[model samples]
Each structure stands twice: as C-alpha cells, then as structure tokens.
Target chain A: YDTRTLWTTPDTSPNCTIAQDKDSKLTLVLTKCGSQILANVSLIVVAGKYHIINNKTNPKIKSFTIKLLFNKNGVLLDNSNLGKAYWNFRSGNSNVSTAYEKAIGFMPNLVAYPKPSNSKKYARDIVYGTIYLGGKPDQPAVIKTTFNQETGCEYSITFNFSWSKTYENVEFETTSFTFSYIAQE
Target chain B: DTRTLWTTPDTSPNCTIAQDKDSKLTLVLTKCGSQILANVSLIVVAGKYHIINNKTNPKIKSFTIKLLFNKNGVLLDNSNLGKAYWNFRSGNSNVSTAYEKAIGFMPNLVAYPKPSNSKKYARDIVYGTIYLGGKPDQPAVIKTTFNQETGCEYSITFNFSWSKTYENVEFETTSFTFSYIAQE
Candidate 1:
C-alpha cells in the first residue's frame, strides 16, 4: 500500500506558527505582507479538516481538506513549495496498496495553492485538488508520482516508495483525528 | 506520523531499503516495538502575539503564504501559488495563542467563533491525551480543553503574530507545550 511520509514545514519562514487547538486539530498559521491587510482565523472545524484511517490492520488517508483564508478583499496568498513528501514503503503487491506508494521511488515537493471554486473573495476563493490514489492506473487517492501536486504547477509533485526489505505490518496510526494545516488568521 | 512494523529481506524486490533523515528525524526499518522511525511527536512551541484584537495593527494570520525563495523581503505573487497545500510533501506551530479578542500564535492555536453568533470567543488551544505508565509523582491519563469551545470545536489553529506592539497589546511571545502521544 502507498502512504506519504517525511512531510515537514520548510521552516524557511519563522513567520509560520504551529498550534494544536482545543479540538485536537493541528493548526499551522503563516504570515505574509501582501495586497490587502486581513485579520481573524476560523475556529470552526469547517476549514483545515482531514481524516486518515490509521487502524493497525489498515492504514490509509480517507479525506483531507485544508483552507487558507484571509479577511482582505483580495487574495494576497500565493502558491509556494514548502517541503518534501514521499512514501516510506516498497510498492509491492499487497493488500496495503495505498495512494502514494510506487515502484520507482520519488520525493514529491509540497506546494501550497488555492482550492477550486470561484467562491473566494479573499475568503471564498479556494484551491482544491484530489490526490490520485495510485501510482498508475485506476486508484486515484494516491499522490501521483511526479504529478503536479498543485492544481496546476510546473514541477510535478509525485509519490514514491523505496525499501530494502519487504516489510509487513508497516502500521499507520492516527495521531489525532485532526491533522495539520496552514492558517490565515 | 508513522512507524515500521516488519521487514523481509528480498533479492528481487521493486525497491531497495535505504536510510533517510531530515532536520530532526531519521527513517528506519527496525522492530515494531523498537523504534518508531517516523514518530512525529511535535512539542507545543512558542510564538509572540495575543488573542485580543489589536484592531488596525492586527497580527498577521499564520501559515497561509507559500515557502518561497526570492531575493527581497517581498511575499506573494499570484503568478505562483503552490499546490503543496493540496499536495503531499510537507508540513507546524509552536503553541502560542489568544483570541479575536486577543492575538499572536500557538503552533496549534484555534479560532473559536466568527465573533458573530455572540456568546463565544476564540483562543489558541491544545487538547491532548497523555498516558501514565512510569508514573512517579505525576498524575496519569488526563483530558481537558483550554480556551476551546467546550460546547463544540472551533475551526481552530489561529495565529495573531505581529511585529510592533500597540498601546493595549502584550508584545511578549507566549510559550506552551501541549500534551502528546501515548504508549503504543
């Protein structure tokens, strides 16, 4: 099965702040000087919500939605690459066939952008995309290797898997029902 | 974020096992009960800012901008918004928070309400569960929420970080370490 691993914030920006909300949600807030000044962040779990089924017997990401919003009238947010993302398993034939695992190992770069839907007005404009769950073929939840992780970007953000041994029970567990996401307070 | 449970040496495998590491972690294929190669137990970190709304000079909300590489202190160019948010391949915050009423950041701070429906306020929060195995004087297995909408979960993870201090602002950075991980 495929799984993304080693994902981290670039830390290039000390401006980025991380926190855990009372609801167990992992919140990431990034600051920038842009088009229009804005304020406030969403406390409702409506934005930056993610779900990964990490049960011992089966481990896979189910649904993940992250939002970066602002109070400004314009979207001052720009798409950026922050970290390296890759799976830590050999994409061998098994019941654990996940979305990102692959034969030719890769290390996809993490890119931040807008979600789909014209609903954004600094608050409504969003950039959303689905991770094709398999390296090749039918499955679509996997991070496609070298595939542009962005809605539409140059460098293809892909999935990868490389391991020396055929490992078993490469278990995945949920750290918290809430994963992590960059915020726009 | 992960751990390796088992491994079988293979002569004809698609991939080859290799070693890996980063700013603070190392990848390993060890025994299940041994090393949790990718155990990402991030401690609550610190960030200056507050929950009080400073109004005009509000602290910038955190983690919406992309991690870019350019010369100037300039940020944001619609010409380029990365899909990293949509893509895998990345990640934090050090916990520091306040409210729409206050400001700053907690790596994991959260906003409670839109400030509308009244009867509500936002605060950076950390709700974690810690176990008691080698307990000595410390209390064991506990759960609680701070500044959280006890009635419900706020969208959460807000940061009011800013540079200059205002007349009514507490410019000092706040420090926090939320509860983390349990015995596996």
Candidate 2:
C-alpha cells in the first residue's frame, strides 16, 4: 500500500509524501486537521474508464486502472491534470488511478476570500458511469468536482475504472452469453 | 431426233453401256471422268438418278453433293437455282427434317445448327429450348441443324437459357413431314 499527501497553499507549490503500507489492508485517516476553515471534501465513488499519465515524459502511455482524490482543494497524489475520456469519462486523462478523490470548497492557506481565480471550479469536465435497476446498463458516470470557497482555493482528483461492453449482470446464470453474432438489420 | 448424248472427257476411263436382264440400260463408268466427250445412245426417258456411293461405300465415306436442279430452263452449273430443297437423312432415315434441333448460346441465345442441312436459309431463327432453366439463366436457340435426318428420327437438343423471357422465345416450321399409310 502506498499513501501520499498534499497541502493546499498559495505557494503554487505542492508538498507530497508517499509511504508504503507493510500490511495487506490498512486504514487511512485524513483531515484538514489544523485548518481553521470549512473544507468540504468527499470520498466519491468513481466507476468509468481511465488511464495513467506519465507526467515526467508524455511519450509512453500505460492505460487502465487509475485513482484520483480531493479532501478539499489541491491535488493530493499523482498530481497531473492531464487526462482523457474514452467512453464515459468525458475528458480522458491517462493519469487516473484506484485512489482517485476530489477536494472541493475551501483551502484556508490556498485561497483568498472568493477571488475569481480562487472560486471552487468543479471538474464537470469529467464523466462517470452508473448502475441501472432496469433496462440496458447505464454509461459510466464521470465525476464532477464542484465547490464554493470564500478565502480558499478549490481542487479535484478522480479515479477511473475500465469495463468491457459485455454485460456484468448477476441475474444471468452465465457471464459469457451476452456476446451475439447476429446482424441487427 | 430421239437420240441422247453421253458426253465425257477423253482422259476418263473406258465406260460400258449395256442392257440388264430387266431390259434397263445401265452405263457403268470405271472411275470418275477426267475429260469431256460426247457419245451417242438411244433416248432414255423417265429415269431417276440413284446414288450408289454413300456411307455404305468406303470410297465416299463422309462425302455429299447437292444437285441444284434448274427447273426454269437454266443450266444447273451456270444458272441460279431458286429455293432448293434439302433431303437430309441419318443412317436410318430416308428424308431430312424441315426443322431440326440445334444448340443455343448464352445471353442472346443465338447459335447456328451444326452440319445444317442447308447453310443458306437466310433467317436468323433456329431451333432452341422453350423453357429457360438453370441458376444463371442459360437460354438456347439453334440457327441450323447438323447431322440431319429425313425420317422419324427426332434431333433432340437442350437449349433453354436462364435469361430467356416469356415472350421473346419462339420457333416455327411449316414444312413438317408426314408419312401417308394405307388404312383399312
């Protein structure tokens, strides 16, 4: 297990600390611990397509499982806004991972009283898929990070998942019968 | 005034004219003539030419000759014989057919009959199949007949094409033959 942390600061700089978990399962606790402002962050459930972006060099690509996160303002780990959308993840970014999260609302050190540039800009630019109760499966919903801040900067991070066009229904006895070869015409 | 002329070439072999036991005059030529000459003999009337050289004779295995008769007082070799009749027959028949079977081609379905009894019919129409058959539509039409016969032998051919329309295919002949028999 790997954990990383970032602080919301107007320094335009980021401080990240990555540590490995020696155990198979670990509990993580993150808070605006000593912040004096109301920071609204969510542990969102993101299920859609994603990719890994190599920020150091944009040459090579490693597609698949990526995560994102936000406790409130500023990127926490694997900080790179460059991404893409394949099917449902609207704007596809290659850097999303399994630990995707978005921090919204206020970051006391990173913002200054509802500055136009300090407004909590939501990533409606992203998409996520959903689970359906009836009919065909829903398209993966992209995660949108939105927040309003008075004196703090807002930020977002997201995790992207991949799924094949084949069905993953539990009602069916078999998982492989969804593939058909008949012409629709 | 009632005499006949027997003219032959000088280079021809010696021929003999004699009366058979039935009192019929028979002129036997040793071989085919090579020159022209005129000889005198008694007037022979009401005579018919009989062919002794045919398929049965090994000397003339596949040979045939058509005699164009000049009925309008014109010489046979020099005058044009108007509308001659062909007497075609197979090994078992005595007369040729007026309308014989023939093969047909594709698309246009036009084909001339093989060994047609006559090559000068001056008509585009021939024998062919009535019903078009096969997957790709093979139609048939015969312009002439080959190996024709004179008797009851029917020349069978399969000439139907797939593209043949219902109204465009037709065959007709008014000169069909019928043998008259004595009935009780």
Candidate 3:
C-alpha cells in the first residue's frame, strides 16, 4: 500500500513526483502548470502495476489508455510488442498487471561486454522497453522516459495533450506526469 | 562411400572442424546447409580406448556421446526441434532394426538466469546407456577402423533392450555401424 523508491526518473522542466495515496495505490502529481486544458496527462505505478489516472479538481480528460512495449538488443523481438495491455476510461480505470513481475522475470540477460568475442550484439543496460499512449487513431500526447539503474523500476510520463478547446492553441503546456517503481526492499 | 556435401542451407552458411585429443575423432559442422541444416560432432570410443568392461576380453559396457544442438544451442530459434536425440547401431540396421538394436541418446536443455546462472548447464550435451542386471555377459564390443585417408568408420554391438510384454520381455544383443566423413 506504500510507495517505495524502487526507481526514479530524471527531472524535466515542470517536474513530477510519485507517491502512495491513502488507498496505498501508487499516485503521481504534475507540478508548475497553467490552468486545466485538454493538453495534460499523468501515469503511476502501484502494487507493482502500471496505471494512468487523472486527479484534477475538474478533470479535463474524460478517458485515456496506456500501452507497454519492450525491446532487447535493439532487435525488437516479436516486433517488441511482446506484451501489450491497455486502459479505457469508459470501462472504468485500467492498469498494467504483472508489469514489474514480467520485467524482472523475462527480461533477457543483456550482454554487457565483448567477452565471448563472437557474441552477437545485445543491449547492455536494464530492460530496453518503452511505453506509448493514445496516438495514431486517437489524440496525441508528449511522452518522457527516465530509468534509474540503482532502482528496479523506470519513471516515464505521457503528457502535453495536443487536444482541448482552452489549451488547444497553446503549443506547449506547463504540467508533466510521472511513473516510477523501486525494485528492491 | 566417398565424402560429399549433400546438404546446405541458403542463409547464414558456415562450417567448422574439430577433433579429439587422440586425433582419432574428427568432426565437421556445416551450418545453414541444405537438406541437413547442420552436421555436429559425435564422440565414440573403441578398442583399448573403450573402458566399460576393461577385462582382458571385455565387452562394450556403455557408450557416451555429446551433441551440440539442443533447444537453445547453435539453432536457438528452431523451436520445433526443441528436443535433441541421436541413434547408434550397425550400419546395416534399417528402420525396423532401429526399434531393436539402435541405442538412442537424449539430455535435458533449459533456459537461463535461474539457479544462479548454473541451471543453464543443460546447454552442454552428454548422454550414455549402461548395461545392468540381465546385462549381456560379454558386454557388446566397439571396433573402430578409422583411417586419415579413408575417413572414420566404427562398428558397435551393444546391449539394446525393448519391452513388448510386461515383466521383462527378455534382453537381446544388438549391433550397428557408424561412419564419419567430411561433406564436400
């Protein structure tokens, strides 16, 4: 129920913070932003899961969805869509279950050095996975990425909605979203 | 029969050669080859080199061999061929003879990261069969007549068993021949 510092992403302008809400569910807050507009979004990790939510006093967004994609050694095995899950605001809130478990369990042991000499090229760092939000057939949003090697989880956000009447004309917004997880106890 | 490269694959084509300590065994692997995607190494021991029943006139107590291709070895993507096996018997042995005289070899192959990177040992291939109980009195013998000029040919007669009926269907002595030649 409590949010642990399993991981944290580097800060970008209009920074974001991650925490556990009263329900013990992971919560995220976007700071330093203009009045509400259709150009805003946020994501969080709770109970080792991925979730996209909205907590504005008067929510500008009525619905949204999040998708998880993975890559290894830049090969993009299985087209990198090895795992895919989405959320629909209309179908109530949605979250990526077993996200952390799958990462730690299946992520290939990326080759770190050139020891074996003839070993094929591979990703050296942690999971070479990525996240994507509503796009291509739906509204578009700006996505950010931050991976803390010391922490088990990754912190990324999808914000800067390119839709909305009040903020429709503005090219950029002030608020940013975040999703972070800590791998260890 | 003279050596001939009958099969080779179209892509990622490559070949390599290997030999044992005594230079008695030579192996050549043809990767991505036609007909046979790859030809790996097979180990065999005979004469004084064969030590199961080391008696004066000893029989071939057992045969041990190691294969290179498994679920994850060489051909890691060949999911359908996940299982690896080999057959040894008299060169004259046919399909029907395989059911009786041929000795089959198989070993476990597992994925990595678990058991502290130790369980991955399954990648190495090593299998054998030993004679026990109603075992053949004169353990089968292995005779290898290999020549640097004529390639390697081995004839083995070992204890291979089958149980058609319940409660021990009787043991039978088996024999087979093995030939190793380079593929042109």
Candidate 4:
C-alpha cells in the first residue's frame, strides 16, 4: 500500500527544520539559535519508530507523539480539521465509530500529566483519556492507546464507548487510516 | 536581540479603538463579530495613560500598553533543564485552582495582572498550547511565561507529535510569543 508522508516540524512561527531520511524517518532539527536534534520518527504502516531526544540546550519540551489513521481503503485518510482524518473502529458485533466523527477529533481537551507507568511504557507512550465521541461535550468515550517501539506491530488502541461501555479494539493494518496535514511543518 | 512587532487587531467581545485626525482616539463599542454599535472619543491628558467611556447603553472599561522591541535584535532559543514547569496565579488559590483559571484562558492571550496583584498592571498575559508527547488533543500541556526583565510579555507553546518514514517527518514543539504595548 502507498504510505502517506507526514512530516512534523516546528510551527512556521518557530525556527526549526524537518529532514527526511532514506528509511522514510523524519529528522527535526531545531535551529532557533544553532542546529540541535529534536526528534526522529516514522509513519510506516508497521514497525514504526518515534525517537525523541532530550536536548538540554532547548529544554522547552521533553518529547511528543502523534497518531495517524489508515482509512477504509487501506490508505491514509484526509480532510476536515487539517485533513478530515479519523480513527475508525468496528467490533465483532458491528459497532463502529471514528475519532473524527464520533469524538469530533481524537484525544481529550487537556493532555493528562503525571502519567502512570506500566513496565517499559514511559509516561509518553501510553495515552489514555476520555474521547469526545459526539459534538456535545457531555458525550464521551474512554480510549487507551499504547505505542510500542520494540514491537512495531504492538501499536494498539482500544475504545470504550459511553454507550453501555461497549469496547472496540483497533489496529492500523486492519482498518484504513487517515493522515491529516495539520500544518505542523 | 531585535524584537518583533506584532499588532492585536481586536479586543474580542469587548471594544476597539481607532485614531482620529485630531490625534484623539475613538473607542468603538461593538459585538465580537465587528458590528458597530456606538463610538466615543477618549479622555486624554499629558503624563496620563487611561481611557474610560461611561456610555449609558454600553459602558467600556479599557486600558492599553505599548512595548518597544528595538529592531535588528537577535533571538536566543534556550532549552529547559531538569524536571521543569512553572505556575502563576493568586497566591490564595490552590495550584490547581490557579491552573484551572489559567487553563480557562487556554490558547488565548490575556493581559497580565499587576505585579502587586493590583488592578494597575501594564503588560499582557500570553497563553498558548503544547501537545504532550502523545495525541494532538490529549497529552497537551500549556506554558505561560512573562519575563518583565527581558520583555513584559506572554508566550504560549504547544508541544505536539507529528510523523515521518525512514523518511517521514515529525515535529515536537511549536511556540508563539505575545507582547503588550498600551496606548493611553
């Protein structure tokens, strides 16, 4: 399948540059004053890598991560906010939802800090929070997402809908993904 | 370091101002959508720095600040050290309360309160977003800072994660700086 290219560079207002490597990994070099390695990442279909450096010179941020979706067509999704991308999910019984439509967009309004650890999972790899499924703030779905560096196949996400706590387990390969261009370059 | 010049076009849901040919100022009362409702000249006096409007239908409470960033200045980007974060708020309020109030104005810029926590502060309070090392909406943190010594201003940074392949692209942090220059 053709993969979508998503480069993450500092916002245009900031002084930074993004370079792509031969393996399709991205290198973010912070050049606000001088060049410094910030992060290197891969948005491959499988066996991806998200490596971040704790550059002491520019300690404003420790690290960061992003989630991409493979649409129903097995291609990266696009459109809406940024690119109309979403996290589509379905279960054995026929429950379906997308982070774009169901939760307006995936993730909670505020990123939870003091992340609890579970083994190799640092505070950064595991993201669990309430997903706003409907447009209304009252409607919410609990979602737990984990990123595994050792096992590229281990990138996983599970959603518990507000309705009856219905659960859905989703992986990128099984479902088509969407990669919205949010102008992070 | 040379400072950048930034202009705030609107006050949002409050009021707006325009300079007249006579060197006086005209304060406009309108909805946030730019609907003109009423206009009045500001009361100005030498060595004074305040403008007040006591209109019957729409009273206006306003103040201004002016910052002069010398052109041709250079900028320095410094990294953080150790476990880091800072807090600002009413000392009486709990850290969380202060955080809640601060977050309440998340992704928006507001004026900084007076140093004595009085009603006579002169600069602006800058605010912005930072996506944590996770999803866009989730794992997002906010940073608000004001350095009166360097420049009496506010700036917000959003830390987000993006993508790349053996050649994919990714970015971790983006920031915006805001300064206040009051025109009395």
Q: What docking grade applies to model 3? A: incorrect
> Per-residue lDDT of B22-55 in model 1, one digit per residue for the tens?
1111111211221111221111112322222346
For model 2 chain A, give the 10-residue run with minimal summed lDDT.
A172-181
Off by over 4 Å in 4: A1-120, A127-129, A149-185, B1-141, B145-184
Question: Candidate 1 chain B — worst ten consecutive residues by lDDT sum?
Answer: B19-28
lDDT, residue A40, model 3: 23
> Comparing 3 and 4 by TM-score, which wins?
4
TM-scores of chain A, one for each prediction? 0.21, 0.18, 0.20, 0.23
Model 1, stretches more than 4 Å misplaced?
A1-28, A31-64, A67-148, A154-185, B1-125, B134-144, B148-184
Q: Give the Cα lDDT of each candidate.
A: 0.22, 0.20, 0.21, 0.22
Which candidate number has the best TM-score? 4
Residue A80 of model 1: what lDDT? 27
Query: What tens-digit string does per-residue lDDT give for candidate 3 at A50-156?
Result: 12433242245432222222332111122111112221011212232322332221221111111123533211111111123332223334342212221112221
Q: Evaluate every candidate with DockQ and list the scores.
A: 0.01, 0.00, 0.01, 0.04
- What is the CA-based DockQ of model 3? 0.01
How is the predicted docking of candidate 2 categorized under the CAPRI scheme? Answer: incorrect
Q: Count the backbone clashes (under 3 Å) in each candidate.
A: 95, 64, 18, 58
Question: What TM-score number comes out for model 2?
Answer: 0.13
